[PDB]
Design a protein around this motif. Structure first.
Motif, short mmCIF file in Angstrom:
data_model
loop_
_atom_site.label_atom_id
_atom_site.label_comp_id
_atom_site.label_asym_id
_atom_site.label_seq_id
_atom_site.Cartn_x
_atom_site.Cartn_y
_atom_site.Cartn_z
N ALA A 76 -13.41 5.74 -0.74
CA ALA A 76 -12.11 5.21 -1.15
C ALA A 76 -11.69 5.81 -2.48
O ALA A 76 -12.50 5.98 -3.39
CB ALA A 76 -12.17 3.69 -1.24
N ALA A 77 -10.40 6.13 -2.59
CA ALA A 77 -9.86 6.69 -3.82
C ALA A 77 -8.55 6.07 -4.27
O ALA A 77 -8.09 6.38 -5.37
CB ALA A 77 -9.66 8.21 -3.67
N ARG A 78 -7.94 5.20 -3.47
CA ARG A 78 -6.69 4.53 -3.79
C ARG A 78 -6.87 3.05 -3.50
O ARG A 78 -7.76 2.66 -2.75
CB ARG A 78 -5.53 5.11 -2.95
CG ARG A 78 -5.19 6.56 -3.27
CD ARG A 78 -4.75 7.31 -2.02
NE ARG A 78 -5.85 7.49 -1.08
CZ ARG A 78 -6.60 8.58 -1.00
NH1 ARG A 78 -6.39 9.62 -1.79
NH2 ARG A 78 -7.58 8.63 -0.11
N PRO A 79 -6.06 2.18 -4.12
CA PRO A 79 -6.19 0.74 -3.86
C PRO A 79 -5.80 0.37 -2.44
O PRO A 79 -5.22 1.16 -1.69
CB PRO A 79 -5.24 0.11 -4.88
CG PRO A 79 -4.30 1.20 -5.26
CD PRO A 79 -5.12 2.44 -5.23
N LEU A 80 -6.15 -0.86 -2.08
CA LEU A 80 -5.95 -1.33 -0.71
C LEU A 80 -4.48 -1.47 -0.35
O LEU A 80 -3.66 -1.90 -1.17
CB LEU A 80 -6.63 -2.68 -0.49
CG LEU A 80 -8.10 -2.80 -0.10
CD1 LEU A 80 -8.29 -2.22 1.28
CD2 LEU A 80 -8.98 -2.09 -1.06
N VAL A 81 -4.16 -1.12 0.88
CA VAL A 81 -2.89 -1.44 1.51
C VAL A 81 -3.19 -2.02 2.87
O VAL A 81 -3.83 -1.37 3.70
CB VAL A 81 -1.98 -0.20 1.62
CG1 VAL A 81 -0.86 -0.46 2.60
CG2 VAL A 81 -1.41 0.16 0.27
N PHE A 120 -7.03 3.03 2.09
CA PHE A 120 -7.77 3.11 0.84
C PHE A 120 -7.16 4.16 -0.07
O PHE A 120 -7.88 5.00 -0.61
CB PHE A 120 -9.24 3.44 1.10
CG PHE A 120 -9.85 2.62 2.17
CD1 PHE A 120 -10.07 1.27 1.98
CD2 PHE A 120 -10.21 3.19 3.38
CE1 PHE A 120 -10.64 0.50 2.96
CE2 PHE A 120 -10.78 2.42 4.38
CZ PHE A 120 -10.99 1.08 4.17
#
Lengths: 78, 101, 445, 420
Positions: free
Chosen positions: A60-65, A78
């Motif tokens: 994971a490299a980005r916040p949750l959607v 992610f």
């Protein structure tokens, strides 16, 4: 006084786990009974990642959607 | 009119379900829409409805009726299932309209 | 400001031909990025059971080094220009995609020409990618949907080159050498079998100039006039049942023979697939879903999910439905899906056909929103139809679709046809093939 | 006006952005600052049940009417929820976009929230959480936020199992009436007229209050949790506090993330320019996947490293990744690699804006956060204005900051936070 019961007074049956493999002549108080616990749903198993090439990109490299919809599958980003 | 209210009260006494402690919504027959309305009922109203039906069945088993003071009256006969039943009827009518169209 | 006016306002593509027959196509948009891809008309349809994994090996080995930029120099250049690179291969097609900025078009097309022309196949890299391919086939074995689609393809096209999967069998993966890969490159990577597709902020004159600069030396001629030839693939009605009761859920795919790429019945059949619909357990529609199969699935809690597919190849295809359910609902889901198929076959409704037409229009346009799906559709269209079918033409065909010809086409392709059934998992309740045939014909029609 | 984005702000705080791109399908999105971050300990999972309650009976349209009308149009009703904000989107043909706006505003402004509907919906809530927790990254980052914040961002994005079966209609109504107001909303639209959007906004959105509830400022705590579940692979995320949305420090953190490796640019690639991938592959021969995790919000951020490794080699992978980031903090980096990272970030932003759905999400997020539209040219200009000393400062901030670690798998060899 080298014992868990002799050191911890009210915490003796919490620090200690007692199971009687053969039932004794005297039953104890608070017999206990599970209240018919439910089951997690039967659902598909995800593929494993047995190689580095398929493993790449799973970090994971980005916040949750969380995406839901009326007629589109729910997606996790992610 | 004013004569309609007294005659409705007389019919309510003559129907006899007040003598067993029922209500009108308790007595109305359980169709599919009524089943949906009862499922949509809150917990307390459902519990008193089921107790009233059970007491009614017990009294009918004994071939007895409640005492006159314990009879329910026309004034206090609340219509609890009416909005839920109306909403279920409206949803069914919308579904039938969409099926027709 | 209507739908047809907007679809006319969609800008048309530009198609040109190089001197060797390599097709060069582009769609220009106002986006600051671009997607440039190379499509090769090659795959398992052309592989001949001896080099069945050669295309998949070349998919793995296409970016591990070339003559001009060996090793990781290609990766260094791609990540320096910031491009996102992809490659894939289906049984009829092989595609190499690069998404980048619009200003890096010469570098992107030079990289693509170097990949598809001067690929270097070093033997240590061959061994490493052989082990990687073996482990990734192990992962795909541990997958669940790909297994049942591979089983469906095998049992539907047995004895023909459409049965063999893209990856190829394990002993063949262990058996291939560099000579087979070079033979595959020299046999199937010919100039008139490639389309160089660009989508986004690209000029067609610049793209054609770059294609003439780089991809003009492909050697379209064959070695000893060893010209391959397309042959029809015989569809068969059959069933394959891989029973393994330890799995939690069952996957069942039931299909019939498709019409093909160039058949104009594909639009009507896609409308019918929109009528049947697709459903997943994580949906928000609930029991009030417009799809009757989805509605009864929610109402009776039958399946985890189902979907409908129409996969097309040269004058053939697989058209049907795939569902995952538990071990105690397979017969109910088969019964309800077949009943919906025959309701479409016998009693089609104009309002539901209009619903499906609207769904299909939304499907194509929302798919074609985006430069890399536009480039993907350009590549598939020029490889299959020989031209890019515009959105106005698709809308015209959809408007031509009505309930009567939907009924006729569904009766032609579904009614009383021997299907291909693939089951994987706890499929004991999956009905017999004779029961599936008895569901395939009705006694009231 | 196909040339420019029409943009206005109502006196009640609502924001309307419109674009006449003449697209065959128009998209309407209402973006509301009503994410999971606006819940205390008493109403956890309310945002999740709201997200799944976006298709219920409303005051003006029944659930049956909403579902049947939307799929008769052929449009898409979708809800995109983050910790910060939620987004309600309808997509469809521009001839039916008035019906789509009517359905969307009916389901997002006046929901009835009947008890029987939510009682039947909580089972779907359980199923949705199970499907979301199929993959380990969701659980890892939920745990990571849980140990990274005391409040106001540690609230889980999915409903807890104890809160399942106890979320009520009055709780949903309280959440809607306190967070679904006009000042915390933005109505964006691609392919629709600005005048038509203005009329539907003044017809549906004049009956909401104001600024609503503020929040709880998302205080940091640090710490770690380890979940041993016997997976074949160990997932470990180690993060620290970073900048919020709207900072040159946050832009430096994004450039640092793309320098350290934010994903693969090549299918089945070796990640040659990825510093952490190179550092781990320098001393390992096992399947691994290491990347840089960046997550900024309205008031705080989280930057760190995410490693998926073998059970035996997890300590070596994590230590190699941390040593690579420490070398970057010391200053072992080149300007060419910084330029390559900036090119990667610019390309990623441009392909994010490329899709019309992504473009709508970007303009709506900008309308919610800043209240004005920043052009992609300006975004690329500030990305180019990021310097390399700022990247060194961001790496030093992550090195010296207090750590939040979420690990799961077979943790017999995964190091602790004091062992790093």
């Amino acid at each position: 006084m080298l014992s868990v019961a002799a050191r911890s007074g009210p915490f003796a049956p919490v620090l200690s786990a007692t199971s009687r493999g053969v039932a004794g002549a005297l039953r104890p108080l608070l017999q206990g009974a599970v209240p018919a616990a439910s089951e997690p749903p039967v659902l598909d198993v995800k593929r494993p990642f047995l190689c580095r090439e398929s493993l790449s990109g799973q970090a994971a490299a980005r916040p949750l959607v969380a995406t839901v919809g009326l007629n589109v599958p729910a997606s996790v980003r992610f | 009119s004013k004569w309609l209210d007294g005659f409705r009260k007389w019919y309510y006494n003559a129907a006899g379900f007040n003598k067993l402690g029922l209500m009108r919504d308790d007595t109305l027959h359980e169709t599919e829409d009524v089943k949906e309305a009862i499922r949509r009922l809150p917990e307390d109203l459902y519990n008193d409805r089921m107790f009233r039906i059970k007491r009614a069945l017990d009294l009918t088993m004994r071939h007895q009726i409640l005492p006159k003071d314990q009879w329910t009256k026309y004034e206090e006969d609340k219509f609890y299932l009416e909005p839920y039943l109306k909403e279920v009827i409206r949803e069914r009518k919308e579904r039938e309209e969409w099926a027709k169209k | 400001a209507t739908f047809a006016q907007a679809l006319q306002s969609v800008p048309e593509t530009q198609v040109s031909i190089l001197d060797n027959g390599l097709r060069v196509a582009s769609e220009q948009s106002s986006h600051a990025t671009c997607t440039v891809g190379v499509w090769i008309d090659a795959g398992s349809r052309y592989e001949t059971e001896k080099n069945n994994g050669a295309g998949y090996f070349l998919e793995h080995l296409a970016f591990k080094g070339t003559k001009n930029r060996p090793g990781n120099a290609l990766e260094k250049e791609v990540e320096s220009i910031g491009a996102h690179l992809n490659a894939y291969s289906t049984r009829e097609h092989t595609a190499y995609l690069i998404k980048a900025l619009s200003k890096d078009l010469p570098k992107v097309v030079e990289l693509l020409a170097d990949i598809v022309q001067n690929s270097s196949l070093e033997d240590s890299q061959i061994e490493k990618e052989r082990d990687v391919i073996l482990r990734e086939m192990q992962e795909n074995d541990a997958s669940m949907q790909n297994v049942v689609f591979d089983y469906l393809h095998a049992t539907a096209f047995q004895g023909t080159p459409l049965a063999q999967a893209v990856e190829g069998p394990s002993e063949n993966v262990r058996r291939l050498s560099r000579t087979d890969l070079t033979d595959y490159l020299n046999r199937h990577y010919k100039a008139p079998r490639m389309v160089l597709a660009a989508a986004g902020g690209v000029e067609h004159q610049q793209l054609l100039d770059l294609a003439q600069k780089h991809l003009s030396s492909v050697s379209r001629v064959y070695e000893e006039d060893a010209v391959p030839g397309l042959t029809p693939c015989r569809f068969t009605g059959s069933e394959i049942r891989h029973r393994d009761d330890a799995l939690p859920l069952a996957h069942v795919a039931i299909a019939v023979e498709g019409p093909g790429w160039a058949n104009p019945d594909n639009v009507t059949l896609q409308v019918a697939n929109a009528i049947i619909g697709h459903y997943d357990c994580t949906y928000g529609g609930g029991v009030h879903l417009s799809s009757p199969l989805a509605s009864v699935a929610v109402a009776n809690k039958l399946c985890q999910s189902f979907q409908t597919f129409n996969i097309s190849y040269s004058d053939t295809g697989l058209l049907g439905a795939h569902f995952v359910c538990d071990a105690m609902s397979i017969d109910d889901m088969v019964f309800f899906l077949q009943g919906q198929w025959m309701r479409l076959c016998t009693s089609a409704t104009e309002s539901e056909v209009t619903r499906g037409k609207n769904i299909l229009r939304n499907a194509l346009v929302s798919h074609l929103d985006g430069t890399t799906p536009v480039c993907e559709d350009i590549g598939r269209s020029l490889l299959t139809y020989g031209r890019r079918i515009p959105l106005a033409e698709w809308e015209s065909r959809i408007q031509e679709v009505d309930a009567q010809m939907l009924r006729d086409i569904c009766s032609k392709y579904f009614y009383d046809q021997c299907p291909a059934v693939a089951g994987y998992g706890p499929i004991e309740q999956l009905p017999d093939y004779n029961r599936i045939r008895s569901g395939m014909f009705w006694l009231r029609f | 006006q196909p040339q420019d984005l029409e943009f206005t702000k109502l006196p009640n705080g609502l924001v309307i952005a419109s674009l006449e791109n003449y697209a065959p399908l128009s998209r309407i999105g209402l973006f509301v600052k009503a994410g999971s971050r606006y819940e205390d300990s008493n109403n956890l999972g309310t945002s999740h049940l709201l997200r799944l309650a976006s298709s219920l009976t409303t005051k003006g349209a029944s659930s049956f009417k909403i579902t049947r009308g939307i799929e008769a149009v052929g449009g898409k009703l979708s809800v995109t929820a983050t910790r910060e904000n939620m987004a309600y989107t309808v997509e469809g043909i521009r001839s039916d976009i008035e019906i789509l706006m009517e359905f969307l505003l009916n389901v997002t402004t006046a929901p009835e929230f009947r008890r029987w509907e939510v009682a039947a919906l909580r089972s779907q809530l359980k199923i949705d959480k199970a499907v979301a927790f199929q993959n380990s990254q969701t659980r890892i980052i939920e745990n990571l936020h849980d140990v990274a914040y005391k409040n106001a961002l540690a609230n889980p994005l999915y409903c807890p199992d104890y809160r399942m079966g106890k979320i009520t209609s009055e709780e949903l109504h309280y959440f809607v009436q306190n967070h679904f107001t006009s000042a915390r909303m933005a109505l964006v639209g691609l392919g629709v007229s600005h005048s038509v959007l203005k009329q539907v906004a003044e017809q549906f959105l004049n009956m909401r209050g104001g600024l609503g509830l503020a929040g709880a400022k998302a205080k940091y705590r640090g710490g770690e949790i380890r979940e041993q579940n016997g997976d074949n692979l160990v997932h470990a995320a180690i993060v620290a506090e970073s900048a919020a949305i709207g900072n040159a420090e946050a832009n430096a953190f994004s450039v640092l993330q793309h320098l350290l490796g934010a994903g693969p640019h090549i299918k089945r690639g070796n990640n040659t320019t990825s510093l952490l991938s190179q550092s781990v592959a320098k001393g390992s021969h096992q399947p691994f996947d290491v990347s840089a995790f960046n997550a900024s919000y309205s008031d705080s951020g989280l930057f760190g490293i995410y490693t998926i490794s073998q059970a035996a080699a997890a300590g070596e992978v994590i230590n190699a990744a941390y040593n690579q980031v420490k070398a970057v903090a010391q200053g072992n980096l080149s300007s060419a690699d910084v330029q390559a990272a900036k090119n990667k970030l610019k390309a990623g932003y441009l392909m994010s804006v490329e899709t019309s759905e992504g473009f709508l999400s970007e303009i709506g997020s900008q309308a919610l956060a800043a209240g004005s539209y920043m052009p992609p040219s300006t975004v690329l200009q500030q990305i180019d204005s990021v310097a390399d000393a700022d990247v060194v400062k961001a790496a030093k901030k992550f090195v010296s900051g207090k750590k939040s670690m979420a690990a799961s798998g077979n943790l017999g060899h995964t190091p602790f936070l004091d062992e790093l």
